[PDB]
């Protein structure tokens, strides 16, 4: 599969429980053989601008898929913080857990395997979580908002907890995000920037018609 | 539409009877503003230069659009030199007309209107045509190959047509492309490049939970 060789390209060229070169390795992989659907260097430098500013003790994820996101976040955490992230399918569940492992990243972050409308509601008595501090959603993007009407329900969400959603724009949450900008439940900002991998190789042919044979 | 908005664009932007101007103005709307189907500049520099190569006399376009390509071809046209450029939707063919007009590059343009399957089989008669030296494929994509079977047989090529298409490989055009590269009739080139306007905006959006009220 796509996910399988993105993974064998990082255990060739990536350095061990190095997760800057991890990051590196994957995003050359994907703008010169194959795209995926990975956040990417140009968002993630937003996200980790995001992250050193608020120094979350607790993030969750919503929707690992290869890892990428896991690494950019699980590297800038401090001494006990934690990540969980969130992965229905259990080929990129495995997928996630070698690239952290590959990244030294392993024991700051913790795999959930299985659906996020099954699991957020076990947090607490599961896996011991008061609220959140901070939550990355980047699954399917019919979800963000259930799911986020979901947390508050459930009790997960505290006075700044900070969402931070990808896709925004492009393929675009756009239940979502009328909901938070029209909520005086929460306060929105923007930060605009590029779809990742995005300089899409085309050509011309020519064709010299050369007579009946 | 966002082709009436196009028009006007140039209407406003560019200057009349300057046809690089027009290409230039068209350019930017859709780098900044509408993301639409031209075939954009660095695609359309290798058309340049082919064009430049083989001075061709006689030119036929398949799918007109807005004009962008028209425009880009009959500038580079020698004196006395044609273009014939077929566009089935009434709407297009109307502002690809307004386009050249505006370009003055209207006496060497004759826009045909109606189905190319329709049309070819109309050329020599209709429109004084013996064979054609070079045809610029951009319409729908899986009508290259039954287009090109379609000229061979009404007897529009000759040894020495160049035939140019467009996106053979995004959003791909396989079944021409196969053909053209097995058959003894077709000697082929590729130029490789990138797909027009693709500098996608996104955005990650930043929530801060509020509280209950
Ligand atoms: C619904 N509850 C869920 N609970 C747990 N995991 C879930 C999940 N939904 C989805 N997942 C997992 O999230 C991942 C899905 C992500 C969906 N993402 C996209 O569609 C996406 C798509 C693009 C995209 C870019 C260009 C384009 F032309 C079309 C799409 C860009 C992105 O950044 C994207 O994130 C998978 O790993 C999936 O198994
Ligand atoms: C079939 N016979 C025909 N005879 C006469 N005119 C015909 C025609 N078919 C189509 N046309 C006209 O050609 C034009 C159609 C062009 C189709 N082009 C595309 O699909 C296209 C699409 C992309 C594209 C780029 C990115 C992407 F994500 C998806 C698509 C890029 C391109 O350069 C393209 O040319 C219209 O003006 C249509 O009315
Ligand atoms: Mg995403
Ligand atoms: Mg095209």
Redesign the interface.
């Known amino acids: 599969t796509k996910e399988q060789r993105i993974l064998r390209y990082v255990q060739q060229n990536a350095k061990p429980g190095d997760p800057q070169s991890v990051l590196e390795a994957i995003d050359t992989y994907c703008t010169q053989k194959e795209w995926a659907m990975n956040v990417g260097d140009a ?1 993630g430098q ?2 980790d601008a ?1 992250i050193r500013e608020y120094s979350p003790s607790l993030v969750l994820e919503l929707g690992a898929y290869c890892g990428y996101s896991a690494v950019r976040m699980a590297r800038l955490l401090q001494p006990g913080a934690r990540l969980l992230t969130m992965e229905m399918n259990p080929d990129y569940a495995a997928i996630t857990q070698q690239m952290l492992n590959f990244a030294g990243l392993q024991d700051k972050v913790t795999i959930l395997n299985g659906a996020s409308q099954d699991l957020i509601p076990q947090l607490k008595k599961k896996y011991d979580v008061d609220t959140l501090d901070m939550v990355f959603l980047d699954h399917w993007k019919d979800r963000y908002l259930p799911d986020t009407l979901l947390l ?1 329900k459930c009790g997960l ?14 393929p675009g949450t756009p239940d979502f ?1 009328a909901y ?1 900008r029209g909520s ?12 990742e991998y ?16």
């Open positions: 968002k937003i996200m995001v508050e969400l505290r006075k700044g907890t900070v969402l931070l959603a990808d896709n925004v724009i492009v995000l938070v005086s439940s929460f306060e929105c900002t923007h930060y605009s920037s590029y779809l995005m300089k899409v190789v085309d050509g011309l042919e020519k064709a010299i018609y050369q007579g009946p044979s």
